[PDB]
Structures are given as structure tokens and as C-alpha cells.
Symmetry: D5
Subunit: 156 residues, 10 copies
């Protein structure tokens, strides 16, 4: 895939159409990703404009959601990524993950440098997963796993 986007609004408009079709058909993201061979977080992100689907997966989810051919092609385009409207989310569900950075951002930096050295934990060589578990004191919890390659910053 050598084709890429420069205006996020094209794929975000498509995302809105996908969400409408998905709601009318009573489909879940887990159902849509099933059979693609790809993780639900990756497929969902592609539907929402933040990843590119391989052609086979694009045709499959296109069949499930009754998408037209321009849409199936758009899902294969490399996106102009960035899902937040204006830098800081307003939505409470999204905001909690930003607050996590406001409270723990320097702790994550400190502990990364302590355990790995100078450098970064990759957001590119990167997997994420959302797992629902029981809360042992009542209710439910989400265990969200961020799994990224350590890339060292070395002198030259």
C-alpha cells in the first residue's frame, strides 16, 4: 500500500457512516473483526480512521457493513491519523486516558528511563488490548495493555 491521505475528515466522515450502518445492523466491533485475522483494537481503529486495512480484511468488513466500493478502497488508504477533535478530549470516557497522562506522565518517563535507558517506548511498534475482568470487590474493571518496543536514544 503506497496510497495515503492528508485530510482526516475524509476517513472520519466514512467512520460516521460505518457507525450508522453498524448501529442499524446491531453489530459489535468484536463481530466485525471476527474472521479478519486481526485484533479487535486494530480493526476498530481502522474503521475509525486511524489504521489501514489489508485488502482482504477491507472487503470482509465491507461485506459485513454493506459498504460501497469507494468506502472499501478508502479503508485501505494510509490515514492522516489523529482522532481527537482539538488536542484535549471533551468526552469523559476519552478524557480519563488523558488524565492518566496528566497524573502519571512523568512517572512513566522516569520508570522507562530506569528500566530501559534513554529513549522511548514505541507508539508504532505497538499493540494494545482491552480486557474486561471482574472487580473482586464488586463490579467490573478494564485491564488495558500497552505493549511497545523500547527504542534507545544512543550517541552518535
Amino acid at each position: 500500500m503506497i496510497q495515503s491521505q492528508i485530510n482526516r475528515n475524509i476517513r472520519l466522515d466514512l467512520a460516521d457512516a460505518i457507525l450508522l450502518s453498524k448501529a442499524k445492523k446491531d453489530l459489535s466491533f468484536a463481530e466485525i473483526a471476527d474472521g479478519t485475522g486481526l485484533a479487535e483494537a486494530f480493526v476498530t481503529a481502522a474503521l475509525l480512521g486511524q489504521q489501514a486495512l489489508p485488502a482482504d480484511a477491507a472487503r470482509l468488513v465491507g461485506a459485513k457493513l454493506d459498504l460501497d466500493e469507494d468506502s472499501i478502497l478508502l479503508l485501505q488508504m494510509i490515514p492522516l491519523r489523529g482522532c481527537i477533535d482539538d488536542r484535549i478530549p471533551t468526552d469523559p470516557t476519552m478524557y480519563r486516558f488523558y488524565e492518566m497522562l496528566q497524573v502519571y506522565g512523568t512517572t512513566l518517563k522516569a520508570l522507562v528511563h530506569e528500566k530501559f535507558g534513554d529513549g522511548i517506548i514505541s507508539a508504532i511498534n505497538f499493540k494494545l488490548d482491552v480486557k474486561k475482568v471482574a472487580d473482586p470487590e464488586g463490579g467490573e474493571r478494564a485491564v488495558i495493555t500497552l505493549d511497545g518496543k523500547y527504542l534507545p536514544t544512543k550517541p552518535f
Copy 2:
């Protein structure tokens, strides 16, 4: 503990002094937290101004770092939280975690509502930890676990 701060600069200035002392003694955050019964991420966050230490822990880490009595008291105050200088990090290590929100923020929202319902994953009823693991293709990875309670949004 009923005492709280309203100006983050007081505790962040203390954090800079702590970091200098820690560098001069060749201490790690794992060693500073050792013997507190508290997770390294929680003790580190407190040192960096983002949590309150119980009195027993504030005296333990305060002895290790050779802190004066006013500083050991400050560490026990409830902070004015927010570690990012101006909303979006400039530091590459910190920025990568913001970038995962730009790429996956709407996917996190979508999968939380799918698995749990309307509501949020808490940043308060919340734990995190950082683990180093080997990458089978060579090198190292960080597995960062965000573990938060689901709190529902219900009609009233």
C-alpha cells in the same frame, strides 16, 4: 490527611530537589520505594508531585533522600495534580503516550462502551505498572498495564 495544595509549583520544585538528591546518591526509584509496601509507580508519582505519601512512607523515603522536615511534610499533602507543563508534552518519551491517545482514543471509547456500557474507565479507582519483557525478534519491550474500574453512566 485533610491538607491539600492549590499551586502545583510547590511540589514540582520539591520534585526537582528530590531528583538532584537522588542523582547524587545514585538511587533508583525501585530502591526508594523498597520497604514502603507501596508500588513503585505510586511512590514515584508522589515524589514527582502527583500523589500523597502516608506519613510512614514519607519519613522512609525522606530519610533516604536527606530531605528536611518541611519537605517530608509536603510529600504527605494532597497535591494539585497535573504533571504536563502546557497540556501536550514536548518530551518524546512522554509524547508517545499522548500519541497513543491520538491514534486509539476513539477505539478505547468504542471498546469500553461495547464491553461495559455507557460510562468511563476510572483514572481514580486505578492502578498502573510498567514491566520490561524480552522481544522475541530481539530487543526489549515495555508492557504498561492500565487497570481501572468501570463506572457506569445510568439514567436518573
Copy 3:
């Protein structure tokens, strides 16, 4: 119960259409919410794009307002919340509530930590109501009640 939105403009455009229909029909928010079993602040918030209506309530208000089927479905979707155009309200009525935060925000923090401890008052496990009362000096007052669960912040 698992479908959600990522672009607030869809539900906010629907809100504008609802307000036009509401004005044409000379309806109040109290009357629209009547018979839903739900509080007027919750139903109003849903009409304005900030909550999800259960199906029976969506169908009832949809009948009152002569909404089409796509609109009745939209009202049941979990919203991308955030009603303020650009972070700070321009509208005087809305701005006074922001001004209360500018004057009393640190006092609210200080008194919450004094009476409850470290942690937050929830905006999720949360009820709001607006009541009109007599001003004992002449005129009228609004008594606005913010009723939120205390969630503690404890070491881990």
C-alpha cells in the same frame, strides 16, 4: 446499549432540529420528559446530545417531537460528550457556571479533601437538578444541586 458516537456534530445537529420542533409545538422540557420516568435534567441532556435515552423514552419523546426513525435511533446512541463550542462558554447564562469554577474551584477541592479525603466527587455517578425558589428579599433564586459519589484516592 453498545453503540457509540465519535463525532459530536451529528447529535448536536439533531439537537438543533429538536429545538426547532420543540419551539414550533410550544413544548417545555418538563412536558417532553413527562411520562418517561426520567428526570428532566437527564432527558434534556439527552436531547442536547449529552446522554443516551433508553429505547422506550427515545420513542416517547420522539413521538412528542415528530422525529423520524433515524433520529429516534440517534438519541439511543452513546454520545461523544462535550457541549461547549470551544472550551469556555461565551453565553452569559452558561458562563456564570464557569465563573463559579474560577472563584470557588480551589475551595471545592479544599473542602472535598477536608470532608472526604484524597480523591474526587464523581461527575459520572452523579445527579443534577435545578429548582426555582423564592428569594426571601424579593425575586427568585435557582438552587442547583450537584450530587456526586465520593471516590477515594488510596495508595497501591
Copy 4:
């Protein structure tokens, strides 16, 4: 009082000194306000730079906190109000009150105009209080009451 301030940093620096003295003396805001005849929310706000104390209350809390005469005078000055560092709070405790505005701001506007008419609920002819109540399902809740006069916008 005809004297007023134009730079919030003077009173906010004083607030930081007050908070340290209060912490060293193991004092609550409730007992600092005790004996003033003034509500805890009002006295607390004055300490934090957001209200002016009358001279008798300023002398009383100044004695409790071992404040010098310049500081006791400063507490009587009419402040340059605004407690939020940079428009949107970073602190989770403070942020939840901003989030209430992002979710319910337009509902508050709508219900105010429905019950009272065109105009505003005053942030000046205004008082607030924080009460702790038991949650029947377990835990505690804060009932925060915002009590403001309705001021109409009338044609002229």
C-alpha cells in the same frame, strides 16, 4: 473596603504560605472559620485569594495562622479573582466540576430559561455549600448546592 488588587499572584503566593502554616498547625478550614460567623466556603475562598475578609475575621484567622500584619491587610483587599492556573483545570478533583459543565452546561441554560426566563443565575448574588451524605448503596456522596439569584434580561 475600597482597596483592591490587580495581580492575582500576590494573594495566591499568600495562599501558599497560609497552606503551609495551616499544615504545620494541623488545622482544618472548618476550625479556621470557627468564630468568624462566616461560612466555611467563604472563609476558605478568602484564604485561597478569591474573597475579601472583613477586618475582624482577617485578624482572627491571621492570629490562628500566625500571619504578619501585611498579610492580614492583604486578606482584606478585594481580590483579582480567578483560581484556575490556565483556564481548564488539570487537577482531577477540580476537573470534575469543569466536566459537569461540559456535560450539563447547555441543560443548565435550557432549564434556567424554561423556569425563570431570559437572563442568568448570578455568580455574585450567590452562595454555595458542600455537604457529606451517606450513599444508601454504600460509601459517601457530596451534595454541593449552588444557590444564585435569577437576574432577568429584559428589553429596553
Copy 5:
């Protein structure tokens, strides 16, 4: 009037249409307001989306401007106020009034507190007028009178 708007663009789009019709008919704001019983500044502000007209005045000016019935209804709705595109005006005529705040804003505060006390001068219980007068040195001057109620801030 109990109906209100939440999206300023509806009434501001109407204002643009009003302005085009007004220019085609070679009408002034003084003549549009003539016969309404209302001050030109109030009627003008309503046309520009910043006030609500009573039903009688709405039908009068709507006849003068050939507005459709939806538009005459819209002029009666309580607006989402805020006429500045993005917080600070770009237009020189409007900017000069902002500049008077940058130069005299703290003087206005100081003199209000000196003559009246703690509190505010209202923007709600408030009237505005613009008068043209001859300058004795040649040319003309605008005398703009801001007439607002004093609302005191007192302890509670």
C-alpha cells in the same frame, strides 16, 4: 418565552440573511426599530443574534425585512450569545472596544470597587446607547454610555 438556542450559528446565519435583505431595501437599524417601542441598540442586537424580540416586535421587523415564519420565530428564541468569532475581534471597529479593556480594564475594576464596593457592574441589568456629538476641535465623537446595576459581593 421559554424556548432557547444552543448553537449560535443558527441565529448568526439568520443575521447574515437579515443584513442582505436590509441592504437591498436600503434600510437603517433606526428605521427597522422604529415603531417597536424598543431601543435601537436592543433591536439591533436581536437582529444580530444577541437578544430575543417579543412577538409583536418580531412580527414588525420580520414584515419590514420579508422574513419567513421560521425566521420570525427564531428571532423570538432566547439566543446562545457571543458575537465574537474567536474571543478577540479582528475587525478594527470592534477591536477598539477590546483595546479600551486592555488599557482601562484594571482602572474600571479599581474605580468600581472604590465607588461601590466589592462586586460587579452588571452586563445583564444593563442598557447601552450610542450618541453622535460634535467635537469642538472639528469632526465628530461617539459618546457610548454603559449603564449597569451594581451588584455587591458580601460575606456569607
Copy 6:
């Protein structure tokens, strides 16, 4: 006067010192200005860093406030004007004047062009004053007069 400033903090720090001296001496702005031959709004603005005092007036107010020689010189310097900390006021008293621009800014533009023509009302060839008047319905009002030269915009 040919000397001018480029960093507003110098004169604003002096204003803070002036305000403390003024409070300790129980002085009003009206009595500080008495004997200068200059309007209270102009002298007050100069003390607050927004105008330059003529030498005789600078020496008179410097004697009343017991200012040092460098301070009396600074008051004569042409300032780097701009009294608002960060573009929009946080203080309620100051904010109300910004709110009058948000509500009436386009009405002021429209009526200026109607009565005078294209161009501006000057903030430079400009006088302002604040008058206290009784409200016939009870209480007090501020009548604030903005008196500016019309400067026309003509083709070239």
C-alpha cells in the same frame, strides 16, 4: 517624553507596590488624583501601568504614596500597555466589560457605521469616566461613559 518601556512587568510590579502603600495609608484613587489637574481615570490608569504621568503629577502622587525616585521616574515613562494577564479576564468585575463586547460588539460596529460611516471610534483620542447614580427601583448603578473621536475610513 521620549522614553518608553517594552516589558509591562516593570510597571505592573510598581503598580503592586503602589497598591500596598495605598492600602497601608487608607488612600483612595480620588484623593491621590486630587491636585494633579487630571481625571481620576487617567491618574489611576497611570498608577496601574497604562498611562504616563506628566512630571508634576508624578511627583505629587509619589509624595502621597512615599515612592522612591526610580518609581517616580517610571511613572513618567510611556508604558507597554496591556492590563489583562492572558487576553480574557478571569476577574468577574473585569469580565463583565468583556461580556458587554461579546453581547454588543457587533451592535456597536453596526451603529457606529450607521451614525458615522466606515471607520472607527478611537481608543486613543478618548476619555472615560465612571459615575455612581441611584437606581429609582432601589440600589445603585454605574454610568460609564466612553467618549472617542470618530476617525473615518475613505478610499485612496
Copy 7:
């Protein structure tokens, strides 16, 4: 002319249409302005939404550009001025003029106060022009002349 605009988008949309017509007809700004009796900088600014044309000139340029009747009228309205999309230009050609302000803005202030006194150089009693001259060292230079009246700031 007593008619004015409040939303720059109306005239800026017209400017885009004018520029398309101008491109299709292979016209220059110099020849559009020829026959108007007005300077090319003034007519060009009017086409671009930043000045109002007299009726005769609006009819003339409207004939050259094949403009409809509403467009010819809009060109005669007093604009809502402000040509920069979002405060600071992105375009390199426009940005250089902003950079001259970042480098020389305080020098312009200093030299204006030195030569003239307290006050401003007008942007209203103002004209500019652009001239091409040969660079003796090779190539070409632009000599851009800004010509504004000095307006003094005097005590009152």
C-alpha cells in the same frame, strides 16, 4: 454607505469567486482597478473583503469580472475586517510581514515615541503602496511604504 457586515465569511467567499473569475479572464489587479480612480492597494483590498468600494467602482469592477447583482452590492458593504485565517499567517509571503513585527515591533514603538510622543501611528488614517525597484547588486526589491497619521495620547 451605512450598511455593514458582521461575519467575514460572506465577503471572503465572494473573494474566492472573484479570484476564480479573475484567473479565468487572465486579469491583473492593476487592470481591474484601472478606471476606478482608486489605488490598486485599496481596490485589491476591497475585492479581498477588507475595504468597501464606492458604488461606481463596484459596478465597474463587477462588470469586468461578470459579477451578479448581489455580489456588486456586497462589495459596497462595510466589511468585517480580518484577512488572517487564524491570527498568525501560515503562508510564507504573508508570514514575512509578521516576522518584521516580531523583529522590529518594539523598535517601531520606541522610534514612534521618540519622534512623535505618546500615542500611535494610525492604521485608519493610513495608506500603503508596493513598489518594485532594481537591486543594484542584482535582482529586485519591494519598497513597501506604510503612511499613517500620528495620533497623540494626551492626559485628561
Copy 8:
């Protein structure tokens, strides 16, 4: 000269000290620049932190202003340029030059492309001059000349 700065506050603090010395000595910028062989706008800009002086000129203005050795050296360093506190000036005198860009920025672009072609007018190969002249209508005007090299943009 190969030494350069990265933090504008160092040279801007020096500028404030220069301004104080200049005021105490009753010197003008034209007087200070006399004998340097350099234009008053260039020398003034250097004093204000926006240009670097050659060694001989730095020593000369240092004598005139009684500057210490570190200050004379600082004036020779290549600056971190940018004189505006926060992107848009608040000061009326400097704001007018920004307004000149808001009104004429797109006209300057259009006329530069018409007279020269694609490319820019330089802010680097660039001279600035401020001239006081008589206003034939009465009073005084500033003729400010911006003289920049045209640099073309051509395909490669």
C-alpha cells in the same frame, strides 16, 4: 561572530536595564546610534534584543550608556529573536502594525505575486526606516519604509 543565544529573556532583561540607563541619562535612540555608522533602527533593535552589534559599536553604545563588560559582550551575541510577549501585541502602538497585517496581509501577498511573481519579500535582506513628516492636512505622519529583497519560488 559565531556566538548565539537560545533564551530571549537574557537579552530582553538587558534591554530593560538599557532603557533605565537611557531614561536616567535623558538620551534618545538617535543620539545613541550617532557615531556607530549604523542606522537608528538597526542599533535600536540591537539594544532591544533583536540584532547583534559589531564590537566597535557595542563598545561605543556601552560607553554612552555606562554598561558593564558582560552587557557589552551580550550585545554582540546573535540573538534569539522575537520581541512580542505572546504572539499578538497588547500595546496599542505595536498593535496597529499587526492590524495593518489583518487588513492588508492578503493584498500584500496578491500585489507581491502580481509585481514580482511567486516567492516572498525578505525580512532578512531587509532595511527598515521610520520618517517623521508633516501632514499637509495638519499634524504629523510616519512614513515607514519596508525595503526587502524579492526571492522567487521556482520549480526544481
Copy 9:
């Protein structure tokens, strides 16, 4: 070419259409530029709204992408340049180039002044190239060459 744009959205909308046609036709940017005699970076920038194509190249790429006559004309107009949506990129691929400025921006300034003197490296007299090279440790690297003329800042 003397025609220029002032609204970037027109050429950016054209870019979106070009990218769709390119994707449907399975074309690369290298293929589109082949035969123009122009560098792939220059032609690609023109397609994306950031350069102007000569007429011959516009017709050639227009035939390849099946563009209408209005589009082929638009590609020849001088653009309103600026490809970033809102100042800082959200897309990871473009963000990395912004991060190189956050890490090395002051080093680039320092080394430019050391090697060349006071002045700039041009973004106008400027060439850009992207090359793929093998990494001898495995994988691939991009070597991106920025080639700009040094323009000196000299006294005048």
C-alpha cells in the same frame, strides 16, 4: 503566473480529489512526476496545494489523473501555503519531523550561526529530497536532505 489564492481550502479540496483519482488509478507520485522535468518532491507538493505547477506540467499530470479544466488551472495558481491543519501535526509520520525541531531546533540555529554567521537558511531558495537506504544493522532508513541558501543578516 500572477494569479494567487487566499483560501487554502480550495487547493486542499482539490488535493483530496487528486488523491482519490490517484488511488483508483494505482499511481505513484514518482509516476505522476515522470516526464515533467520536475523533482518528485516539487510535483507532489503542488498536487497537495503547496506549490504552483507550470502550465506544461499541469496539463501532463492533469491528463494522467483525469482532472477537469478548472482543476488544471487551479494547480497553476500560486497557493496560500500551509499544509498543517492546526499548527502542530497530529499524524505520527509528520509529527516526527516536528519532534526533530523540538529536539534539534536550537542546535540547528547554533550550528548555522557557527558555520555561516547571523542570518537564516532559506525555506524559499530551497530543495528537498527523500532517499531510501539500507540500514547495515537490518531494515531501511530515510535520508532526507534539506538544501537551502544561506541569507546573511548584516548591519545597515
Copy 10:
């Protein structure tokens, strides 16, 4: 190295002191880096607070610049990176590199995806250098080479 910083001002204050000593000693960055075995861009960046020096190079440059022991230790700490004061540079020399991104950022994205695929060019596994060459048309040019590892974005 496991010690890291959280407040950039510490290392940036050290950078200012380094620059003063460097200027007093008439040192260049090339000769400060001589004998460290490290590229001049890397050593310069460390001095300016954006990289960490190994112990040997820290002692070696610290001797050349006559740094105390706390400073030599600081240079070895992992920095809080980010050299731009407020997101967009004001300085012309650094602004040009930002402008390169405003003109070519989307072209860099497009060509990276075409030559490499989905993913990024690393700013971490990354080196840069600045070379001075002759301009064959006359003058001098900078050739700035950005050399970064391609990191692919792959489905998971």
C-alpha cells in the same frame, strides 16, 4: 544512566550559563566537541539540554567550559526534551525549519509512505548533520541531512 529530569528549565538554565562561558572563552561548538568522539550535533544538543552526555564527554566538555561538578552531573542526566519556548519558534533562523514543515510536511508523509509503506521515519534512531557548501550560482548553502530509521506500522 537511569537518572532523568522532569523540568526542562533546569538544563535550559545550565545551557544559558554554558553559552556565556563559551562566549567569554571564544569557543566554537566544533572545538568543544573535539576529542569527545561524538558528532558536533549530538554534543551541541546535549549542551543545549536536549541530549545526555556520557560521563567521559561530560567531564571533557566541562573542563573546556569550566563547569562546576553539579553542572557536569546535570549534563549526564536524561533530559526533559523540548527546546521551543512555546510550540512555534519566533526566531527567524529556527522558524525556517518550521516553515519547511508547513510547506512540505504532507509531501514528506506522502513520499515516506510511497517509498517505505505505512509507519514513520524515526526521530530516535536518528542522526543529523549540517554541512556548509558553495552555492553554484553564488553564495553559500546549508545541506542538512536527516537520517532516520524506517519503523513500519503493521497489522496485529
